[PDB]
Amino acid sequence: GRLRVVVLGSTGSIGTQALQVIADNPDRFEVVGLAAGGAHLDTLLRQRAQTGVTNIAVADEHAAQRVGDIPYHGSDAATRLVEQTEADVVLNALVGALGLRPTLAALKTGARLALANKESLVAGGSLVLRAARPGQIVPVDSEHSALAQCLRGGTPDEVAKLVLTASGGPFRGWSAADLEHVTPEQAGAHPTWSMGPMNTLNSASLVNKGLEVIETHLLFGIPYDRIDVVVHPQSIIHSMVTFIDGSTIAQASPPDMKLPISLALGWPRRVSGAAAACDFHTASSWEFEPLDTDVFPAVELARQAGVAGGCMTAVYNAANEEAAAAFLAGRIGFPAIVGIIADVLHAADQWAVEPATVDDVLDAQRWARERAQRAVSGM
């Protein structure tokens, strides 16, 4: 009954909330491993003491002089912890490229993979899928957790559409003329060394929803032309599934990541008390409006990248990362982010091949960065 859980990226927001859910539920879960990057060593050490878990990894080569009591340390240390720790669930909340090999290791162990790491699916694609058994991957992000829940409303052949909700970002309702000369700071993105301003920027450009559509297709096996996005400013409905009879099943809750976290850890069994439920003691309004696709082409661009297939979704994300960073540095304008992604994709015919190995993914990403860097330099 007690599930053995490895928490990768234990020091970030998702990691710390999962440990909190586990801490509140020692009857359901037992932490058996922790991993984090060398920059976060001090927090990891505090976590070792608090949990009593000695099976810990420093996920990279950093903090090299401060390692000497850490059982795994070095570039692929998180992957080694996963390969070597008996577990029922691996929560992968590592950020970026660090998350991919641990994902593949996790799947090869036969454990459930509670996946928070976006690169795993977006860059890894079928490399990751080929390693998974049906139902082995359970998503942690709000939208995908909602979808996994709503898909219980019928059989796979009864599914008509998957409908992701989107907040709309800071620029919901704005015209293309209005967005021509917006600044990073106006996007809510105040550039910092963390992923925060980049996540915020992705929300503003709708690239994040583009990424989520890609993940939706890979997770649930639904064609891109049946994955819709609806703007829903309140973010109470986290996503929905429309079935062949006209019925839509939606999942709703006040925003709290502990709900989808708990469900991913405990799948298929729900975790009593993870989050507060919707309260109807107060009058409220849930609004829905179409996405302005002419103004926010990032989502359709993701569909194009996804339809092309293979390493094309890795290209999409790597191109975004470069174009986005350039916008953060004041080197390009806002509309050029998605303009550059499209330019890079148009030049990327060699990268539609399905990845045979991790190196294929890494090669596609390196090529995409170079291409984006050239595109940036030319304006």
Q: Interface with a second copy by CB under 8 A: which residues? A: 149-150, 152-155, 158, 160-161, 163, 228, 230, 237, 240, 242-254, 256, 259, 262-263, 269-278, 280-290
> Which CB sits closer to ligand 34F, 302 or 375?
302
Beta bridge partners of 228: 163
Q: Which residues 6+ apart lie within 8 Å of 354 measured at CB?
A: 125, 126, 127, 309, 310, 311
> Which CB sits closer to ligand 34F, 14 or 87?
14
β strands within 24-135, DSSP E: 29-36, 56-58, 72-73, 89-92, 112-115
Q: Which does 263 bind (CB under 5 to 8 A by kind): Mn ion, ligand 34F, a second copy, none?
A: a second copy
* Contacts to ligand 34F by CB under 6 A: 141-143, 166-167, 169, 203, 208-209, 235, 255
State the first-to-last Cα distance of the chain, in angstroms, to the nearest integer: 59
Residue type, 208: N
> Residue 84 is encoded by which pair of tokens?
């070597």
CA distance 40 to 60: 11
Beta bridge partners of 165: 230
> Residue 133 is encoded by which pair of tokens?
């058994």
CA distance 138 to 264: 6
In angstroms, what is the minimal distance from the CB of 285 to a second copy? 5
In angstroms, what is the minimal distance from the CB of 9 to Mn ion? 16
Q: Which does 161 bind (CB under 5 to 8 A by kind): a second copy, ligand 34F, Mn ion, none?
A: a second copy
In angstroms, what is the minimal distance from the CB of 92 to Mn ion? 15
**Among 60, 119, 141, 300, interactor with Mn ion by CB under 5 A:** 141
Q: Which does 285 bind (CB under 5 to 8 A by kind): a second copy, ligand 34F, Mn ion, none?
A: a second copy
In angstroms, what is the minimal distance from the CB of 268 to ligand 34F? 20
> Which CB sits closer to Mn ion, 113 or 372?
113
> Residue 104 is encoded by which pair of tokens?
């593949």
Q: Which does 203 bind (CB under 5 to 8 A by kind): a second copy, Mn ion, ligand 34F, none?
A: ligand 34F
Q: How many residues make up the chain in this entry?
A: 379
